Amino acid sequence: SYCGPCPKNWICYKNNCYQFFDESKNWYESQASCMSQNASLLKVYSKEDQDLLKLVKSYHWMGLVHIPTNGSWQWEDGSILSPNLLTIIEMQKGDCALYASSFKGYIENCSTPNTYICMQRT
Amino acid sequence: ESYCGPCPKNWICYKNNCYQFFDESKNWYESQASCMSQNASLLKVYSKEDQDLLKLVKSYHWMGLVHIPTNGSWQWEDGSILSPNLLTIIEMQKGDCALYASSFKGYIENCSTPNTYICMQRT
Amino acid sequence: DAHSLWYNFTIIHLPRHGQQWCEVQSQVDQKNFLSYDCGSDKVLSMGHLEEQLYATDAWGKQLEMLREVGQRLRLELADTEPLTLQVRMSCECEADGYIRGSWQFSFDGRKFLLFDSNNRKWTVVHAGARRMKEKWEKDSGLTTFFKMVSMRDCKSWLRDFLMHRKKRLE
């Protein structure tokens, strides 16, 4: 009946707090931006709990960072990208991922300006 | 930091408003009915400010916008009239109903053709 | 060697008879494998069932995007400058990976616009297409949608169909 604690004017859904920034900046900058407001970039951990993410259009930086040695990815908070959550689209050389509609993540150059999503739960 | 208004269970709460997107395709009437059976109505656009997240929406969906057969103006389910400043209406297909599309755009559609929809509930 | 993937859309604004507003024919390495009603989510005739392209993760993703591309083009077709928009989206992998992603737009059988995803250049083919170019060139979202889907999504399904086309054989 009440959506979990969130800042002012932040999208709240199932007690998660999202915020889409129209401003176009690079991953590094996007990271800091969220950082600078007690929040992370965007971490996908549940298709169910994070259902609304399939209605979003365009591409947005997520809090994904990979280790190009295990071809694996992990989030800012140190946790690994659990399988069966995101369909990572692989043209590379890039080392960052952009969240795209219907649980997809396009790998791109981390220095390419782009809109981003900040998340904060609880 | 604060709380977001009272909203039904599992509904996108934003700027004290509630939304819910249905993947189920119904025609306007069938959709409108669905929102009514949930103490809600079809999406209603009154403020690009209070509802900016609407430019985030992918695809087209029914919104509670209808056409008045005489004066050729559009009105919401509640009766009020669309205010010049919110939507740009483009004809996609025949009908007297309007689908919403990302970036405050209203697309005309056959009221009887099945589409997904967006129920709202002004807090 | 090089491989390609061609998607030929037929989008109609204000369909007249029993015409479906969305239709798409596809070809893998220049030849057919799927006819799909991108408007009602329906495979109409996916000839070439000896490679089970379906039964690949790419298959559904592919149909997903075919529907999204069809819906985007529909709205765009609704506010142009019954109208039949014929579009061909293509991607081709060479021996290195050099993927060429491009789009071709027609409106009644006469080519109108060409989009080079790679160089991201919109080039006019018809005098009367100068305005749509402007509009779409300035619609950064649309144009980027055309680059992302043809340069990556399409190469992705190509890669998976191929990688699958072999494991069977060898």
Curated annotation (Swiss-Prot), chain A:
Originating organism: Homo sapiens (Human)
Keyword Glycoprotein: yes
Signals that turn on the gene: Up-regulated by interleukin IL15 in primary NK cells.
Keywords for the protein's UniProt record, in alphabetical order: Adaptive immunity, Cell membrane, Differentiation, Disulfide bond, Glycoprotein, Immunity, Innate immunity, Lectin, Membrane, Receptor, Signal-anchor, Transmembrane, Transmembrane helix
Places the protein is found: Cell membrane
Gene of this entry: KLRK1
Membrane topology label: Single-pass type II membrane protein
Tissue-specificity statement: Expressed in natural killer (NK) cells, CD8(+) alpha-beta and gamma-delta T-cells. Expressed on essentially all CD56+CD3- NK cells from freshly isolated PBMC. Expressed in interferon-producing killer dendritic cells (IKDCs).
Entry keyword NAD: no
Record-annotated C-type lectin domain positions: 5-120
Disulfide bonding pattern of the chain: 3-12, 6-17, 34-118, 96-110
Extra remark: Is not capable of signal transduction by itself, but operates through the adapter protein HCST. Some families of ligands for human and mouse KLRK1 receptors have been characterized being very similar in structure and highly likely to be orthologs. In humans, an additional distinct subfamily of ligands (MICA and MICB) differs structurally, having an extra MHC alpha 3-like domain.
Known role: Functions as an activating and costimulatory receptor involved in immunosurveillance upon binding to various cellular stress-inducible ligands displayed at the surface of autologous tumor cells and virus-infected cells. Provides both stimulatory and costimulatory innate immune responses on activated killer (NK) cells, leading to cytotoxic activity. Acts as a costimulatory receptor for T-cell receptor (TCR) in CD8(+) T-cell-mediated adaptive immune responses by amplifying T-cell activation. Stimulates perforin-mediated elimination of ligand-expressing tumor cells.
GO function term, MF aspect, one: carbohydrate binding
Residues of the full protein shown: 94 to 215 of 216
Membrane topology, Extracellular segments: 1-122
GO BP: any one term: positive regulation of natural killer cell mediated cytotoxicity
Residues carrying covalently attached carbohydrate according to the record: 38, 70, 109
Protein name in UniProt: NKG2-D type II integral membrane protein
Domain of life: Eukaryota
Subunit annotation: Homodimer; disulfide-linked. Heterohexamer composed of two subunits of KLRK1 and four subunits of HCST/DAP10. Interacts (via transmembrane domain) with HCST/DAP10 (via transmembrane domain); the interaction is required for KLRK1 NK cell surface and induces NK cell-mediated cytotoxicity. Does not interact with TYROBP. Interacts with CEACAM1; recruits PTPN6 that dephosphorylates VAV1.
Gene Ontology annotations for the cellular component aspect, listed alphabetically: cell surface; external side of plasma membrane; membrane; plasma membrane
Signal peptide positions on this chain: none
UniProtKB/Swiss-Prot annotation, chain C:
Region (MHC class I alpha-1 like): 1-81
Protein name: UL16-binding protein 3
Residues represented out of the complete protein: 30 to 207 of 244
Transmembrane spans: none
Any one GO cellular component localisation term in the record: extracellular space
Keyword Signal assigned: yes
Places the protein is found: Cell membrane
Tree of life domain: Eukaryota
Gene: ULBP3
GO molecular function: natural killer cell lectin-like receptor binding
Bridged cysteine pairs (disulfide): 22-38, 91-154
Function field: Binds and activates the KLRK1/NKG2D receptor, mediating natural killer cell cytotoxicity.
Additional record remark: UL16-binding proteins (ULBPs) are unusual members of the extended MHC class I superfamily. They do not contain the alpha 3 domain and lack a transmembrane domain.
